[PDB]
Design a protein around this ligand. Structure first.
Ligand SMILES: Nc1ncnc2c1ncn2[C@@H]1O[C@H](COP(=O)(O)OP(=O)(O)NP(=O)(O)O)[C@@H](O)[C@H]1O
Ligand SMILES: Nc1ncnc2c1ncn2[C@@H]1O[C@H](COP(=O)(O)OP(=O)(O)NP(=O)(O)O)[C@@H](O)[C@H]1O
Ligand SMILES: Nc1ncnc2c1ncn2[C@@H]1O[C@H](COP(=O)(O)OP(=O)(O)NP(=O)(O)O)[C@@H](O)[C@H]1O
Ligand SMILES: Nc1ncnc2c1ncn2[C@@H]1O[C@H](COP(=O)(O)OP(=O)(O)NP(=O)(O)O)[C@@H](O)[C@H]1O
Ligand SMILES: [Mg+2]
Ligand SMILES: [Mg+2]
Ligand SMILES: [Zn+2]
Ligand SMILES: [Zn+2]
Lengths: 743, 743
DNA sequence: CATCGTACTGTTACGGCTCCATCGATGGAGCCGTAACAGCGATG
DNA sequence: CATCGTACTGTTACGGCTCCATCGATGGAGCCGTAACAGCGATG
């Protein structure tokens, strides 16, 4: 009935007790960094997996592996759990859609089980001959030589001595006793005539005996000579007329149609019902989410973000179970509203089978389509990790201590601008863009305003922007050695002086990385430290103060601090001599131990450091430490670190900003902060282009370039273009339909 | 609170609903073949394992594997389950006790984690030098050449050009500027003097700088020359003074003592607490059950039945968990009463940790030491598979519908004989028996009476009987080519004419085996069928009617009948022509489809077949089919088939019967049947020797030869010898102590 | 001590069948640190 | 058209570190089927 958790203390959680209803659609909600992932994935799934694994052999435990033991007193009401991680995976080039979805294994099993390559037994042969009409004259032959050249005299003598008298050679029956002649260089088909029977009921015994002796003499080969009829031969991989490659070269929808109407007998059904059911469920889920155009032979590395996310989901939740907790960590990454609604319908269908759904989400549609909501807060980092509200959507909305309820209820909102900026005659015209699935379209992107590129997941917006416009602009301005996509020409590059791009790619997590190193400010800090008088006296350089460089780092901990915390250097990753150069009475370890807000006051005089620290504060990461390990960063925190890294660069007043879905893992407040930053950048005279699926960002855009009307080969055309109201007035545009209810 | 099972239909179960209390000692009870194993192992454990496995990846599912899906409507209250199978396992010769118990892996991890092979950092070297007293004169050296021969002129010139002036050669300090001479064929130790410091507080910076430059110049080698003191060298697997082989060559008790008082610092404890805890738990369980004499390097194939069973238990239940169902299928195989009591104490300790115990048992001590009892019956095979009684021990005893309650309450019992047979001057004297752990004892075994060999598990009774007496008797009488054990001589063999032995070994389960083939009566049946007139007319032989021979078996099913049941031959494993030779109007398939009681009436005229069928009926297997697959036979049924096979042989009135614990897997009624058969054999003038642990069998024996007083190196001596009352009068004999409460 | 009588029982080798125990590495991608390269004004 | 000014910013190649995806076989033992081998009586 309930999953009772008491005394949860993982990461930033503070002894929180929660009762999660079972067999319900439960949504975990909070600010970015509050501890939803630590509450669900790091506690509930971790404990369930640990309990299941601990009852296994040492070989199995080593092969599978278990996560770290959570700091929870006791958790009850558990069951088998299937979890989808928040982090996106990068796949090998050899990987395939069918291999990732695991339909290839089921296809291989089906082909090895029921794939038809004639193997007949004695009884089957007897029945086959019995199928003939009564009165037909037949002869049973035992071919000893089939396609060979030789004198064949000893063999004939042995056959005659065995007892057989009738032998047919070259299709003519001759007596073995009478001498015969045959060319040694000419192929001959020597066959022994065993019996000359008649077809009538009641000769089963004699026919079976003759077939048995023929099979014994000819080693499993029987030839039935039908007098006046066509001769037949009896001896001891495609399904439905399609090979494995042929069935793997079809679309998902066509494969589902083929597997839905294939003709199978009772034996084949009883043999492969389970495999057919698994394949049907997987293909049905793939068609339901919207991936009915991809072929099963497509490489998984070439898929877009939304398609990759949907295939990752289909790998785990493709075939539903019963009595299993499903933990999904933001399954709506890079998905349009339509795709999110289809996923929600699939999730409700999965829950209706008798499953518990524990979905961590930042979306509002999931919030409105949820039975129960658990709110965490009231802040992020050390200021969160405790439940601030609980109940249904309405109770959360009426709750004054929940920020997400405040944003849902309209108390806090992102204002829709009263007046939108208009283009001033400067445009970027892309002519003949035919990259990937684009259909030779001409797109004009206004300069100096806020532009949003909208469209369904897979419609061709990343390929239009990142693969063509950004690459051409980089080659023109930054002199990068990258080749752009397929296009005729781009006009209007002379109006720009720089390009800054944030891509839609995973962020690498390493123990050698932290916000300071990622943003590039640690280099300035190290140079400042190495420029002091003490470092000059001791002959130190910038690499001495790096914990990844074996010049001043502690060798006991190998620069990591933990081997169990280190004791010689106290886990600070620096030896005692390095931790003596002090800038403003503070060494490098305490500088790394500062928060962003503290570093704002400490480094308020150095402009290069101050700009980056101010950007990190602006994206809302003021609570984070400058030296926190990147492996211990959340998805939203890592995304915001990347955003600050790219947005803390110099602006000349004519630069172009390109962002590829920068909202991933961001709560509605972080979206507000990002929107404010972007609009300030635009007001400074720059131009910002955002490939976005969020309606809160979209409704504040001055220009919108919709793409579609579908994904894959069904997309690649501009379906709407103009201000958000004009796009909303378009009937056939999905983004306009969803904007009509927002504006 | 409860594990609710509804609609269980696995094997012979008939829609039984059971509520098993949780966190209790629950014992499953019934006749042999009633369906206890199918109820527990084939339903509850199977469903739990299937549910846990289905939530895993395809790779993991293939690597681990899952059992067949049970025919159960729904089962609730499940949790992770650890199960010990009833079947005994045969291990490879290379296997070891430590490897089987899985202590070897933990030992390897401990040695790889904390095993000490001097790796020092700069700070550690500085601290070590600072440990010296104040005022001491030291010199830092960088040895560039250590044990080499050469002219060494370019190296000296390079060192001088670098800046260093002081170089010590052959232990004498010389100036690099002044010319020096050295033999090219003589080894020289060239060392560069870097600094000549003093020991006082406040020289940490200079000392660290000198150590760093010395380490850089000499590539991680530092030599500290203490003036007036012993020189020391600083540079950049045994635990507790014992190697891995040394710690693996100790006894289990000594290893536990060593691991209980080993000296470890805080770092080592924080590193390997989990490994130490696992090793301590495993060794504590091994000592508790009674295996405190085996060394961890002993081969597992040389262990006795009880030791092997205890080690198999310790593999799974050695380290306890919490909230886990433990399913044990007869864990008291080949164990004395004392060992069974120790195992019961361990099981109660395991249950007190918060675990559910589901123990299938035939013993009475387990019944009396159980919180809840579930009784199945009222018979075996198709006559059982339904719950006939339920409740505590007293309720079961008062229940009139439970046979086990009847035997517990004394309503049904095995009578103790009023008068015991006395030896008639014929004895079998074994002189100088020193096989295995025997201590050169002389044992006299009376002839013509019922003799029982008793003793603790491991005391040396199987080695005394099977390895010496049976092998010598076989070599003397049956002319077998087997070498006996270590003994001087055996007297009295001239009083015997034959020997029949039932060994304590596993029974192989193959699809090609059934009771008819195992007992050897199928050969007679096949000969009878091949001797008919129809088979003579069709030229058939005895191998034609064998389903394992490719002469008359169906090739579609390959003689197995199932490929999904076969359709051409209807799964009968014979082709249509073979199923036409009828003996008394019945072919081979219906003969194989007979029960033992049916075959008693059908074959009542053929004496050779009738004797074997009558023996199979006598051991109580009248409900079984003559052709039931051996893979679908229970442990008790297989044991009884083996017993009937060996006891259905000719008796000359002077044969010797040797049985090595024939009670394994037998309920108290099957024991009564076996005791009656054995006593009839003895009354026919034969002699029976039984190595038994069952008190019901023991109390009916005319003579008893106790062995002990312990197992392993602590046993091998006769502690009692005489009638059961005389043995009961012995104070130091465990068997006498347990018999005192029975007689 | 020789002769006769309507195809005899029990126990072992040997080949074929089947079940069960026992046992990380390589390439790809992202990131950090370091080296390398390009890019107002006044007077005679 | 030449001259002067108290160690300058931003973006790319390249090597080293680290995380993550992806992928049955062999010997031993037991059993079955087949071939192989050993083992009263009366008369002259
Ligand atoms: N291993 C760790 N040790 C200590 N703190 C951690 C660790 N991992 C994460 N944190 C911090 O704990 C807080 C909560 O992290 P997490 O539970 O991942 O957040 P989240 O709610 O899933 N946020 P997001 O996914 O961005 O919406 C953040 O401040 C993290 O930086
Ligand atoms: N390298 C490639 N080769 C072939 N087809 C590709 C390749 N990359 C992408 N595609 C396809 O091109 C179409 C558009 O993908 P893309 O333009 O990258 O995505 P998008 O429209 O931005 N969608 P998303 O990022 O998920 O919201 C999809 O059908 C992709 O599968
Ligand atoms: N796979 C099977 N299919 C059909 N019947 C089976 C199968 N396995 C076992 N049986 C029969 O089902 C009955 C119960 O078997 P099982 O559940 O193993 O008994 P059990 O109570 O554990 N007996 P035992 O272990 O000897 O004390 C017996 O008559 C078996 O012969
Ligand atoms: N091949 C062997 N080499 C060395 N020791 C052995 C061997 N076989 C058995 N032992 C040991 O000899 C002792 C007696 O074993 P054994 O006589 O076979 O058992 P048992 O007394 O009949 N006990 P059990 O059958 O379990 O009730 C035990 O300590 C065994 O570990
Ligand atoms: Mg998260
Ligand atoms: Mg059983
Ligand atoms: Zn250290
Ligand atoms: Zn068949």
């Amino acid at each position: 009935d309930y999953i009772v958790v008491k005394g949860a203390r993982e990461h930033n959680l503070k002894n929180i007790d929660v009762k999660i209803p079972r067999d319900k659609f439960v949504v975990i909600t909070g600010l970015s960094g509050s501890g939803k992932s630590s509450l669900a994935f790091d506690t509930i799934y971790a404990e369930g997996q640990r309990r299941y694994v601990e009852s296994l052999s040492s070989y199995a435990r080593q092969f599978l592996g278990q996560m770290e033991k959570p700091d929870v007193d006791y958790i009850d009401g558990l069951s088998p759990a299937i979890a989808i991680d928040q982090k996106t995976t990068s796949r090998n080039p050899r990987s395939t859609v069918g291999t990732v979805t695991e339909i290839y294994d089921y296809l291989r099993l089906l082909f090895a089980r029921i794939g038809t390559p004639s193997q007949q037994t004695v009884d089957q042969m007897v029945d086959r001959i019995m199928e003939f009409e009564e009165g037909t004259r037949i002869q049973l032959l035992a071919p000893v030589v089939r396609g060979r050249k030789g004198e064949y005299h000893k063999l004939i003598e042995d056959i005659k001595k065995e007892g057989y008298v009738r032998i047919r050679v070259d299709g003519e029956v001759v007596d073995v006793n009478d001498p015969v002649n045959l060319d040694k260089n000419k192929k001959h088909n020597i066959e022994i005539v065993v019996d000359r029977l008649i077809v009538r009921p009641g000769i089963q015994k004699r026919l079976t005996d003759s077939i048995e002796t023929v099979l014994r003499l000819s080693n499993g080969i029987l030839v039935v000579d039908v007098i006046g009829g066509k001769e037949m031969l009896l001896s001891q991989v495609t399904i439905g007329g399609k090979n494995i490659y042929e069935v793997c070269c079809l679309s998902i929808g066509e494969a589902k149609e083929f597997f839905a109407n294939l003709n199978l007998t009772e034996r084949q059904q009883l043999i492969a019902r389970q495999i057919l059911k698994e394949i049907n469920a997987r293909l049905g889920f793939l068609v339901d989410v919207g991936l009915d155009y991809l072929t099963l032979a497509r490489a998984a590395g070439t898929l877009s973000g939304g398609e990759a996310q949907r295939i990752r989901l289909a790998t785990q939740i493709g075939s539903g179970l019963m009595g299993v907790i499903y933990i999904l960590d933001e399954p709506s990454i890079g998905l349009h509203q339509r795709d999110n609604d289809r996923l929600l319908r699939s999730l409700k269908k999965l829950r209706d089978l008798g499953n518990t759904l524990l979905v961590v989400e930042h979306d509002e549609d999931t919030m409105y389509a949820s039975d129960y909501i658990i709110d965490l807060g009231p802040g992020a980092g050390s200021h969160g990790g405790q439940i601030v509200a609980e109940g249904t959507v309405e109770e959360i909305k009426q709750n004054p201590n929940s920020v997400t309820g405040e944003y849902l209820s309209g108390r806090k909102k992102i204002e829709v601008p009263k007046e939108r900026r208009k283009p001033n005659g400067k445009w970027l015209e892309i002519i003949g863009a035919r990259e990937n699935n684009l259909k030779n379209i001409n797109v004009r992107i206004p300069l100096g305003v806020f532009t949003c590129i909208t469209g369904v997941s897979g419609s061709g917006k990343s390929s239009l922007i990142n693969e063509i416009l950004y690459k051409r602009l980089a080659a023109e301005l930054n002199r990068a050695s990258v080749k752009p996509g397929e296009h005729d020409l781009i006009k209007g590059i002379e109006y720009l002086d720089k390009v800054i791009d944030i891509d839609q790619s995973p962020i690498g997590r390493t123990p050698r990385s932290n916000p300071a190193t990622y943003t590039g400010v640690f280099d300035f800090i190290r140079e400042i430290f190495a420029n002091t008088t003490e470092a000059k006296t001791r002959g130190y350089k910038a690499g001495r103060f790096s914990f990844n460089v074996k010049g001043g780092r502690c060798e006991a901990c190998a620069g990591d601090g933990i081997n169990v915390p280190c004791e010689v250097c106290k886990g600070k990753r620096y030896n005692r001599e390095t931790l003596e150069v002090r800038y403003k009475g503070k060494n490098i370890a305490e500088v790394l131990d500062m928060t962003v807000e503290e570093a704002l006051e400490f480094f308020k005089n150095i402009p290069r450091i101050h700009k980056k620290i101010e950007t990190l504060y602006d994206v809302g990461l003021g609570y984070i430490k400058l030296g926190q390990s990147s492996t211990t960063l959340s998805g939203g925190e890592a995304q915001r670190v990347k955003l600050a890294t790219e947005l803390s660069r110099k602006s000349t007043g004519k630069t172009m900003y390109i962002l590829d879905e920068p909202t991933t893992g961001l709560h509605m407040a972080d979206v507000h902060r990002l929107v404010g930053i972007l609009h300030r950048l635009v007001e400074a005279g720059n131009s910002v282009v955002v490939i976005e699926h969020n309606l809160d960002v979209i409704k504040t855009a001055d220009y919108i370039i919709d793409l579609g009307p579908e994904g894959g080969s069904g997309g690649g055309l501009v379906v709407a273009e103009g201000t958000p109201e004009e796009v909303a007035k378009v009937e056939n545009s999905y983004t306009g339909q969803f904007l009509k209810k927002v504006l």
